């Protein structure tokens, strides 16, 4: 039981540790003649 | 559209914000062409 609980908590902790460097969405604004770059930003953030 | 269409701007020049226009065109499924200013409405200018 001790080895099992050490294993599962280690597995969970490595799951938390590997996901600290995810993608963070930042709000960027574009005007009406910047719609291609707005679409590019939307697709990049949504794809990540 | 073809990759290199031969029939574009017959008279040399440019279309301003042409790629933004095509980006807007990629969200339009139908046009209705309407005469907004008739060619016969220029009495003091030459149209022919």
Structure description:
The structure is cut from a larger assembly and holds two copies of chain A (48 residues). Chain A has two helices and no strands. Chain A is mostly helical and 48 residues long. At the A-B interface, helix 2 of A face helix 1 of B.
Write a concise synopsis of the structure shown:
This is part of a larger assembly, with two copies of chain A (48 residues). Chain A is built from two helices and no strands.
Largest interface, C-beta within 8 A: A-B, 4 and 5 residues
Q: Beta fraction of the residues of chain A?
A: under 5%
What's the main sheet of chain A like?
none
N- to C-terminal distance of chain A: 39 Å
Rg value of chain A: 20 Å
Which structural traits does this protein have?
part of a larger assembly; 2 chains; 48 residues; mainly alpha
Helix-strand layout with pairing:
This is part of a larger assembly, with two copies of chain A (48 residues).
Chain A: H1 2-18, H2 35-47
């Amino acid at each position: 039981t001790q080895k099992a609980i050490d294993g599962v908590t280690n597995k969970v902790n490595s799951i938390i540790d590997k996901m600290n460097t995810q993608f963070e969405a930042v709000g960027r604004e574009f005007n009406n003649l910047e719609r291609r770059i707005e679409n590019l930003n939307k697709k990049m953030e949504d794809g990540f | 559209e073809r990759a290199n269409p031969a029939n574009d701007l017959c008279y040399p020049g440019s279309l301003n914000d042409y790629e933004e226009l095509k980006h807007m065109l990629s969200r339009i499924n139908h046009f209705e062409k309407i005469q907004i200013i008739p060619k016969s409405s220029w009495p003091n200018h030459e149209t022919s």
